[PDB]
Amino acid sequence: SEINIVPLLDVLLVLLLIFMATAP
Amino acid sequence: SEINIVPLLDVLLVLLLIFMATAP
Amino acid sequence: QNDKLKRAIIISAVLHVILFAALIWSSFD
Amino acid sequence: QNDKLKRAIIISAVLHVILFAALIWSSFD
Amino acid sequence: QNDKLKRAIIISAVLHVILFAALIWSSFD
Amino acid sequence: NILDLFLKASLLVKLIMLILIGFSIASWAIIIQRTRILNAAAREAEAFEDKFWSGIELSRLYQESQGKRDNLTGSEQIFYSGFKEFVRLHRANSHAPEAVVEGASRAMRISMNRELENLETHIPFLGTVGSISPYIGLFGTVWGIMHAFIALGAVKQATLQMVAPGIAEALIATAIGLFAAIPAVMAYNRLNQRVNKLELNYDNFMEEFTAILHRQA
Amino acid sequence: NILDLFLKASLLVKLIMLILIGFSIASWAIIIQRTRILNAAAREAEAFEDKFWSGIELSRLYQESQGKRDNLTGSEQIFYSGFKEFVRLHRANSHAPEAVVEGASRAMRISMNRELENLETHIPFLGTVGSISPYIGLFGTVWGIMHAFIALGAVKQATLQMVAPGIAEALIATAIGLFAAIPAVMAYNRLNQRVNKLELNYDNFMEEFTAILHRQA
Amino acid sequence: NILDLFLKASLLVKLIMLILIGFSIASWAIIIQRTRILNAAAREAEAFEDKFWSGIELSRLYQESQGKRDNLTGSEQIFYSGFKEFVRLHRANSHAPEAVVEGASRAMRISMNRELENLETHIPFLGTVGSISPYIGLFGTVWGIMHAFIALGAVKQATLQMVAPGIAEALIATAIGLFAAIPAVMAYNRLNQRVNKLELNYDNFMEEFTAILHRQA
Amino acid sequence: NILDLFLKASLLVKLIMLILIGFSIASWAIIIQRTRILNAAAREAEAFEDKFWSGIELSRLYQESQGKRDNLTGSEQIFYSGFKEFVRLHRANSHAPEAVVEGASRAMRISMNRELENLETHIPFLGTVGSISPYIGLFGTVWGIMHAFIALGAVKQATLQMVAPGIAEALIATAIGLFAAIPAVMAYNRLNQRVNKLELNYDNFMEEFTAILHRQA
Amino acid sequence: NILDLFLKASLLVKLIMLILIGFSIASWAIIIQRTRILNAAAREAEAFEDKFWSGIELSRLYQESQGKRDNLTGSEQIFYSGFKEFVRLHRANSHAPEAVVEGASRAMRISMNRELENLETHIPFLGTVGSISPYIGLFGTVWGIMHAFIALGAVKQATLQMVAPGIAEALIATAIGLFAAIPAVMAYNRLNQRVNKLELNYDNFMEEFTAILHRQA
């Protein structure tokens, strides 16, 4: 009985791409 | 032998916070 | 133990309702 | 055992206070 | 024993080479 | 403005949030109820273990147990059923000793199985909550972000402030998921350990009592 | 539509989506198939366990068991194999009484192992699916994200209108992965618990039958 | 500086910080207090085992043990209980040797179980704290990210002050969560392997004592 | 595309990728090798276990084994060692049954230990690879991000589009690390489960053979 | 550059770096020290195993061991202690053969435990270092980034170009931690495996010598 938060990296990368895309 | 995921999540969160702080 | 289970359910429900209401009220402020 | 628990709690509290003071001092430098 | 290990090593190597070649090709598309 | 965010969210997000709240409410009460039962059972077993080996004759113990009728629970029920069937088979004519011993042993096994089944109720439900809770929240967050981008795509030219409120509303589900997930994971292991520790004592007591009665006949 | 997004996707994304859909279908089929068998086995075992202790002579039970020999299962099969080995060894050779009991015990153990192996089919695949699917989804998303970063590295003055379809396609893979991974985890533990609870009845019956065979040997 | 950010944060973040601080204090106290008890138990066990193999008559040791009966602990209590049960059984009704051997064995087992239960306390709490420590920090970081995104949604252009609180609260939550988890991880296995070696010494002593008692009767 | 990024990478990143690829190749080779050996050992053990209980005299089996006069594998080795020890130990030294039984059992234990050691090679390498692999990927990611940020400050123009490639390199490194890591982590447990069952079967066979030898003393 | 890094770094940043460097040096020194000791122990054990089976009478081996005097390690120490205890117990003529055999076995067990404890020194420090190292680096990185962000708000002339040198220096902390932690796990596993290998040889020799000594009684 543990906690799996593996899919959270997906959301982190998706959100990270937004800031880079709208940089200029 | 089990996969340790916490350090990767911490590094990703740190990078995301760094990118967010530079928005303004 | 069934009546004790119902009492525990009621106590948990009322405590959760009170805590959530307090958190929501403090969130606006 | 309970007295040992109280002594351990007191020691831990003193150590935590000292560590917090050291952290606050190091935050300025 | 050793010959079987060598054969398994060769099979793994060729499979990995094929997989990497397939992955590289998909990048141009 | 948490209430405003809850009202503004789509149907699926609200449904998932209600489901998670229901799981949390159902989860707390089970732990609160089961801890007391396990704690009481431990001391009752210790007390009965203390009383049995005092050197008192078995007939006196049976006479004491007769009055308490159905109030007997735990190892007391085991002793009552075992001695009852032992006496019933012994008073029958033309009896082999080993047959009577086995007849008592099967009753002891049945009683112990019933007691364990009664004790271990509702425990497996916590593991399902602890293992499924975060996934639903992540699914809700992904769905919310997907529809946020779908709504953003309607206008091809937009800035971050056009989509920023949508993302913040989506991340609500994962927090509630983790909040519901943590306590069940915390409590399940301790409950299982207590159950196993209690079962071992009953096994040992049954073995010793079966061994003792063999020399009686 | 989703079909349009599937069509415009490259080979890798299509393959990943097809694999995930296949895993979902296989998991549902396995759960549905295994539930009925695990339900029927317990009923048959309980019925035979109730029938056995009626006090009928073992020879009559063995004679009746030969009528439907090709369709026996569970405790009936265990008892049939044990009795057959016992009678063959006793009436075909002259040895010490302990050797016959040892051979009967070995035959019963082998039969029980075969029965458990037949009962425990196709279970670990659910656990493998549950432990594998999220990583496949993450890889499928990371591929697209890396390609989007490579594309954005060369272009200038991005308006967030060119990379939106990439995010829209990437999110669906993770959503499908989570949906596939949800039910296998909850099915696995329940099925394992049922099998573990079923093993003890066979163990107890083997011990009791060996003890019974010892006396009449 | 840190106090400014802590005060500026909402109440939920402060509650999470307080919970983490409490867990850290409790873990430190338990780790401090367990080692002295373990070392004292080991030294006492070795010291008592030294005197048992010196050729002194067992009757003299039993007489000496009575003088401090109420304060007996460690390996000394097992011998006391075993010898008391053996002498009581032998002095009464002239029981068979197997009966007195089994009585000594059961008394020794009960005493050993009680002693091991006394030794192992609060150890699983450290493991639970070490396992579940960082996820509360992740909860806090998620809430901080949500607050930062909500702040970024203002109509006006964002500034440093508008996004200052969320970043600070998330960083503080992560830092405290990481800080609270080190000692439990560093101490759990070292504390468990300490008891795992005393159990073996107790088992060996029990076997030797039973073997010695076998010849006397 | 990606090949250009790999060509433009630094030395340490390329070395890390090569090391990870080599580890993956070695792990896959070992995994492919071990399974056939395990299955062959299982079937060979089952065949000889079946051959033992057919009823043929043990002397004939020993004569056939000696006539083979070659290295054996599985349960055949244990029987040969035990019988060879028994043949000399029965006539020589003490004729008490306990001494001969213990002497045969010691040889059986030694043979079991050496066979188990010979069957369990190259397994811990998979575990150590699974434990160590992700940290190298994280090291590569951190190094890439550090160099990307260091290079940015050397120019007057500050654009994130200039920083974009380093993130892609870091993500590639992390993905390769996880891909190398996972399969060994699964295979370690998947392989240990089989060795446990083989050990149990060997122990049961040893117990049966020891009883059979003892009953004729 | 190290002096520049230390000058530019504040408190709680250089202390962590010094601790990590010390841990790396200590781990390397411990590994280098222990490899030779283990190799020499293995060679000496093999040599004495070769010597024992030469057919020389036990008495002559005893004078050879006495000629060696104080300098004895492992099997030599076990044999010397066992023979000394056996002779001392036998000369008294006040104990049964089983008593003297048990007394002889106890001394050998104690000597074996002491030798294993002497061999197994300093191993757990490697495990502690490997388990702890990354988290200290993460804590240092978080603290450094917090300080860098805090110092930025003081100057209102901030630019995205001027923060890159400050951000770059913070991440050096975690790389050192990972580099320190990498070899510790592999060294720990290999050393533990070698110790486990030696334990079996010691146990086998102890059992064989106990049987041989009991034979002459």
Residue numbers in the entry:
A (entry chain F), B (entry chain G): 14 to 37
C (entry chain I), D (entry chain J), E (entry chain H): 7 to 35
F (entry chain D), G (entry chain C), H (entry chain E), I (entry chain B), J (entry chain A): 5 to 221
What is the paper's account of this structure, in its own sentences?
The Tol-Pal system is essential for maintaining outer membrane (OM) stability during cell division in Gram-negative bacteria. The inner membrane complex TolQRA harnesses proton motive force (PMF) to establish transient interactions within the periplasm, thereby coordinating cell envelope remodeling and facilitating OM invagination at division sites. TolQ forms a pentameric structure similar to that of MotA and ExbB, exhibiting a volcano-like configuration with a narrow periplasmic end and a wider cytoplasmic base. The pentameric TolQ encapsulates the dimeric TolR through its N-terminal transmembrane helices at the periplasmic end.
